[PDB]
Amino acid sequence: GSELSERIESFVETLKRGGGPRSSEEMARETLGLLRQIITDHRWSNAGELMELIRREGRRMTAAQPSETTVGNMVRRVLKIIREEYGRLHGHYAQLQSNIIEAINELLVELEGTMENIAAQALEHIHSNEVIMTIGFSRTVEAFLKEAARKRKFHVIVAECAPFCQGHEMAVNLSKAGIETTVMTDAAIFAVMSRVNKVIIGTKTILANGALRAVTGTHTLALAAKHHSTPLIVCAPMFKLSPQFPNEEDSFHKFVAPEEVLPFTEGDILEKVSVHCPVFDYVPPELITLFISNIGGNAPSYIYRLMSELYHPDDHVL
């Protein structure tokens, strides 16, 4: 009641203001915690009433941060789980609730071992004396690299995503493990791409076409990799996979303050300039070769089957 609405309002304002928490897996765990806390302390007669309640509570989290699709498609996965439980019990008050409890607990068991399974199958994609190029900062790709370097000796080009230099942290965290890393800017991507053998990047949101949004400037890396014919490896979990079509809804990119691009101390020329800072970008699925999830490697021509197995077509509007 009071604590429920208090924590819901706190989560909504946390998604409205900034990125809280920092890890997307931690935000997914807090999303499952919010959904189990909202189903354990409420009352319903029909399962469709709970479906409408979860939809009404998810619309606010979607309108809080539209660029954060993880809470929205996790709400949609929990909606499909509750729909499948109502379907298997339809062909109902405490038994359905206990089934929802054990299913969301099984979802946390599956979600805690996602990066572990990605690091487990990391060995079948990296050979010795290999030139790797990445962009931005992501825990999945650096875990991939620090597991692949346990038995193999290779090189990683840590290209920074530079609206704000977050890839320096990835370069330092790899060089502490000894991956023989090299730091450059966004302007040397195609200049170094003639020596890059594979492209291993992360993403923020996998779309329904197999398209993906990620840290900005990676569409340029995908174009240079398609020019030089190198395969792209997308190490991405199964909760960044969303049924939002690219040109269907607006607010695709996330815009931040232009201070990180052009500072406030520039002068009188700030009045007559328009400085936009997209921290994301669009990558079409034909520029992608392989997706790496915790269940195995999948093609961009196979994301629709995971969409059918994880999502329901009457929930794509939410």
Residues within the interface to ligand C7B (CB under 6 A): 129, 131, 155, 157, 182, 192, 195
Span from 103-111, 179-187, 192-200, 286-294 in contact with its own copies (CB under 8 A)? 192-200
143: partner contacted, choices its own copies, ligand C7B, none (Cβ within 5-8 A by kind): none
Residue 128 interacts with its own copies (CB under 8 A): yes or no: no
Instruction: Tell me which of ligand C7B, its own copies, none is bound by residue 228, counting a contact when its beta carbon lies within the kind-specific cut-off of 5 to 8 angstroms.
Output: its own copies
Q: Does 45 bind its own copies (CB under 8 A)?
A: no
Q: Residue 258 Cβ, how far from ligand C7B at the closest point, in Å?
A: 30
The residue behind tokens 């962009």 is 135
Based on the shown chain and the rule CB under 8 A, indicate whether residue 194 belongs to the binding site for its own copies. Answer: yes
If the CB atoms of residues 37 and 182 are measured against its own copies, the closer one turns out to be 182
* Closer by beta carbon to its own copies, 138 or else 289: 289
CB of 221 to ligand C7B, least distance (A): 14
Sheet holding 198-201, edge to edge: 181-184, 155-159, 131-135, 198-201, 232-235, 290-293, 296-298
Residue 289: φ, ψ to 5°? -100, -50
Q: Which residue has the tokens 């189990």?
A: 36
- Number of other residues whose CB lies within 10 A of the CB of residue 226: 16
Nearest to 216 by CA among 155, 263, 165: 165
DSSP 230: P
Minimum gap (Å) between residue 196 Cβ and ligand C7B = 7
Q: Least distance (Å) from its own copies to the CB of residue 132? A: 13
Give the shortest CB-180-to-its own copies separation in angstroms. Answer: 12
User: Residue 198 pairs with which residues in a beta bridge?
Assistant: 132
The site string for its own copies over 216-235 (x = CB under 8 A, - otherwise) reads -----------xxxx-----
Alpha-carbon distance values, 43 to 32, 47, 93, 135 (Å): 19, 11, 9, 47
User: Which residue from 177, 176, 174, 140 is spatially nearest to 156, judged by alpha carbons?
Assistant: 174
Q: Which residues in this chain contact its own copies in the complex, by CB under 8 A? A: 194-195, 197, 227-230
